[PDB]
Amino acid sequence: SMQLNPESADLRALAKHLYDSYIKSFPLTKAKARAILTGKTTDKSPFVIYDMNSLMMGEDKIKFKHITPLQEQSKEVAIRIFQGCQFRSVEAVQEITEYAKSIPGFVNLDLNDQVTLLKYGVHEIIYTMLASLMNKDGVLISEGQGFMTREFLKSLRKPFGDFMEPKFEFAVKFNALELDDSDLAIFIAVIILSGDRPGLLNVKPIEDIQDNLLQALELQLKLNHPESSQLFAKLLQKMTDLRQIVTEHVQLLQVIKKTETDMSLHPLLQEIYKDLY
Ligand SMILES: Cc1cccc(Nc2cc(Cl)nc(SCC(=O)O)n2)c1C
Ligand SMILES: Cc1cccc(Nc2cc(Cl)nc(SCC(=O)O)n2)c1C
C-alpha cells in the first residue's frame, strides 16, 4: 500500500538526516571500503599483513598514529594485535557516540539513558560496521591503510586464534545482503535506540524514536532494494544474531582475562563488559 504522503516524505527526511550524520561520523564508509577491497580506488593500495614478516614491515609502514610504549612493543605479536584491536574498539565507541548524538531525539533523552543505550549498543554496531571492512580474505585496518588476512589472524596462539573468526562468518553472510551506507545509517540508529537495554529510566520515549526509525528502515529497503521483499525481515534476524556474537565475544574475553592475567584490558571496555551478564 506504499504511497507518497506527508508521512513518507518525513521518513525520507529522517533517512537523509541519518545518512548525512553517518557520513560526518565515520571517516571510512562502506562505499570507500569496497572501493579499496576491489582495487577500484585511485588511492595507493593498502599494505597487506599475511604473515609475521609482513606484520613487522607493516608495523613499520602503517601510520597507526597512537604511540605504543616500550612496554607493549616488548609484548608478543598476538597481544600487540589484540591491544591494537582494543584501541580501535575505543575509537569506534567515540565515532558511534558522535553518530548517536545526530539521531533526532537522542540528546533529549535522559543523559544516563543516552549512556546505557551506547554501552549495550556499541559492540552490535562495531560488528555491523566491521563487516563493511571485511571480505573472504581479510579485514581493512588503520582506516583502510592496511589489510590483515583472515588466516594470519587464525594463526595467532590460543586464545587469540579465534577472536575475529565469528565476525568474519557474520560478515560474509551480512555482506551478501548488499546493504549500502544509506541502509546501514538507519539499521545502526534502530539498534542504538533499543528500548529493552537493562537499567534505562524512560523506555517509551526510546521506543517512540525507534518505531519511527523502523518505518524509515522498511521504506528505505523497499525503495533501495527492488531485488528482495525479504530484506527487512532478514535484517531484524541480523539484529538478534548480533546480540549472540556479542555474548560469545564476552565468553572469549573471560577465557583471555582468566588465562592471560598479565595483559591489560582498556578500562573503558572493562566499564562496558562489566554488566554483559
Ligand atoms: C599502538 C600500535 C602501534 C603500531 C602497531 C600496533 N599493532 C597492531 C598491529 C595490527 Cl596488524 N593491527 C593493529 S590494530 C588493527 C586495527 O586498526 O583495526 N595494531 C599497535 C598496537
Ligand atoms: C573497526 C575495527 C577493526 C579491527 C578490529 C576492531 N576491533 C575488534 C574486532 C574484534 Cl573481531 N575483536 C576485537 S577484541 C577487542 C575488544 O573489543 O575487546 N576488537 C575494530 C573495532
From Swiss-Prot:
Subcellular compartments: Nucleus; Cytoplasm
Swiss-Prot/TrEMBL keywords: Activator, Biological rhythms, Cytoplasm, Diabetes mellitus, Disease variant, DNA-binding, Glycoprotein, Isopeptide bond, Metal-binding, Nucleus, Obesity, Phosphoprotein, Receptor, Transcription, Transcription regulation, Ubl conjugation, Zinc, Zinc-finger
Induction: (Microbial infection) Expression increases when incubated with M.tuberculosis or its lipoprotein LpqH; induction is TLR2-dependent (at protein level).
Motif (9aaTAD): 267-275
Cross-link entry Glycyl lysine isopeptide (Lys-Gly) (interchain with G-Cter in ubiquitin), positions: 24
PTM description: Phosphorylated in basal conditions and dephosphorylated when treated with the ligand. May be dephosphorylated by PPP5C. Ubiquitinated by E3 ubiquitin-protein ligase complex containing FBXO9; leading to proteasomal degradation. Ubiquitinated at Lys-24 by TRIM55 leading to proteasomal degradation. Ubiquitinated by E3 ubiquitin-protein ligase STUB1/CHIP; leading to proteasomal degradation.
Entry comment describing in which tissues the protein is expressed: Highest expression in adipose tissue. Lower in skeletal muscle, spleen, heart and liver. Also detectable in placenta, lung and ovary.
Regulation: PDPK1 activates its transcriptional activity independently of its kinase activity.
UniProt domain NR LBD: residue ranges: 10-275
A biological-process GO annotation: negative regulation of transcription by RNA polymerase II
Primary location class: nucleus
GO cellular component: chromatin; cytosol; intracellular membrane-bounded organelle; nucleoplasm; nucleus; receptor complex; RNA polymerase II transcription regulator complex
One example GO MF annotation: RNA polymerase II cis-regulatory region sequence-specific DNA binding
Binding annotation for rosiglitazone: 86-89, 123, 249, 273
Effect of residue 86 to P: In colon cancer; sporadic; somatic mutation; loss of ligand-binding
Region ranges (Interaction with FAM120B): 3-52
UniProt KW Phosphoprotein keyword: yes
UniProt record similarity statement: Belongs to the nuclear hormone receptor family. NR1 subfamily.
Assembly information from the UniProt record: Interacts with FOXO1 (acetylated form). Heterodimer with other nuclear receptors, such as RXRA. The heterodimer with the retinoic acid receptor RXRA is called adipocyte-specific transcription factor ARF6. Interacts with NCOA6 coactivator, leading to a strong increase in transcription of target genes. Interacts with coactivator PPARBP, leading to a mild increase in transcription of target genes. Interacts with NOCA7 in a ligand-inducible manner. Interacts with NCOA1 and NCOA2 LXXLL motifs. Interacts with ASXL1, ASXL2, DNTTIP2, FAM120B, MAP2K1/MEK1, NR0B2, PDPK1, PRDM16, PRMT2 and TGFB1I1.
Comment field on protein domains: The 9aaTAD motif is a transactivation domain present in a large number of yeast and animal transcription factors.
Function, in words: Nuclear receptor that binds peroxisome proliferators such as hypolipidemic drugs and fatty acids. Once activated by a ligand, the nuclear receptor binds to DNA specific PPAR response elements (PPRE) and modulates the transcription of its target genes, such as acyl-CoA oxidase. It therefore controls the peroxisomal beta-oxidation pathway of fatty acids. Key regulator of adipocyte differentiation and glucose homeostasis. ARF6 acts as a key regulator of the tissue-specific adipocyte P2 (aP2) enhancer. (Microbial infection) Upon treatment with M.tuberculosis or its lipoprotein LpqH, phosphorylation of MAPK p38 and IL-6 production are modulated, probably via this protein.
Disease per record: Defects in PPARG can lead to type 2 insulin-resistant diabetes and hyptertension. PPARG mutations may be associated with colon cancer. Obesity: A condition characterized by an increase of body weight beyond the limitation of skeletal and physical requirements, as the result of excessive accumulation of body fat.
Stated name of the protein: Peroxisome proliferator-activated receptor gamma
Source organism of this protein record: Homo sapiens
